[PDB]
A paper describes a structure:
Peroxisome-proliferator-activated receptor gamma (PPARG or PPARγ) is a ligand-activated nuclear receptor and master regulator of adipogenesis. Here we disclose the discovery of a series of chloro-nitro-arene covalent inverse-agonists of PPARγ that exploit a benzoxazole core to improve interactions with corepressors NCOR1 and NCOR2. The extended benzoxazole core brought a lipophilic arene in close contact with the lipophilic surface of the corepressor NCOR2, while the binding of the chloro-nitroarene warhead sequestered Helix-12, an essential binding surface for the coactivator MED1, deep inside the protein. Interestingly, agonists led to decreased signals in the inverse-agonist biochemical assay with NCOR2 peptide, and inverse-agonists conversely decreased the signal in the agonist assay with the MED1 peptide. This indicates that inverse-agonists may induce a structural conformation that disrupts basal interactions between PPARγ and coactivators, further shifting the equilibrium from activation to repression.
Residue numbers in the entry:
A (entry chain A): 202 to 259, 276 to 457, 463 to 477
B (entry chain C): 2347 to 2359
The structure:
Amino acid sequence: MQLNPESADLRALAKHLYDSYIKSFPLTKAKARAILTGKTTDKSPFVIYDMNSLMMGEEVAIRIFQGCQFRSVEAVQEITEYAKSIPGFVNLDLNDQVTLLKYGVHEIIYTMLASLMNKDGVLISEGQGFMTREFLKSLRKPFGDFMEPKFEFAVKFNALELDDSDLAIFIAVIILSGDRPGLLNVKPIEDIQDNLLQALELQLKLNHPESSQLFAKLLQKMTDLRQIVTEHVQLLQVIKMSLHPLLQEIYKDLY
Amino acid sequence: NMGLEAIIRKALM
Ligand SMILES: *c1ccc([N+](=O)[O-])cc1C(=O)Nc1ccc2oc(-c3cccc(C)c3)nc2c1
């Protein structure tokens, strides 16, 4: 591996994407991690770990889903804005742009949800609450099974120890998937993804000397992410059961 | 479906 015009153009793409990521996403992984380790005086979250702490702290399913889906709108707008900054993206057929985001945003939401999770739980009410994993898991079926696979994904994903620089290229790779159903012009999307993949591979070698197969492990995680999105459809069937209104409100902030 | 599509088209313009 050599330092040359190719590599410099790839480091320039990585920087361009990092900058547009920072403009596009107010809640970064660095900020999330800071909250979870108790640095941010500003945000010291109340921990909800059981029914009693739930009270102090202040189809049911379909209603939750209607809720979170509408609350995703801000994230969807941020990712859409982020996509406009990927070189070539706005030159693609408009329908493909829309198809790429329609499928991609769910994967990106779960990717950025991992930033808000550790093994103990997940940040809620934008940094102000912390819902424990085992409390969520304790709830009655089917609700108890909702978040547990995302924690499983998040623990394995967070163990890769990606930073925001890494994540900005990863997210771009996800957006530019040539296999999404109904794409019209697969080739120009693959052309962009090829370039982003090169940038990601360089980024990971420079930023992660500890793990020389991180590139592959991180691509495999796209498979995991695809599975979690797909599992939501199968959970609609399992569902076809009362739940405390405060837990309903909390679930509407997850995904 | 068309909700998400619409929000994305709005966002893209
Ligand atoms: C909201 C709130 C809480 C949970 N939960 O605890 O599992 C889930 C949601 C939710 O609605 N999540 C969600 C997951 C996956 C989704 O995939 C789509 C979707 C929509 C349109 C096109 C595609 C390809 C995928 N929407 C989802 C919503």
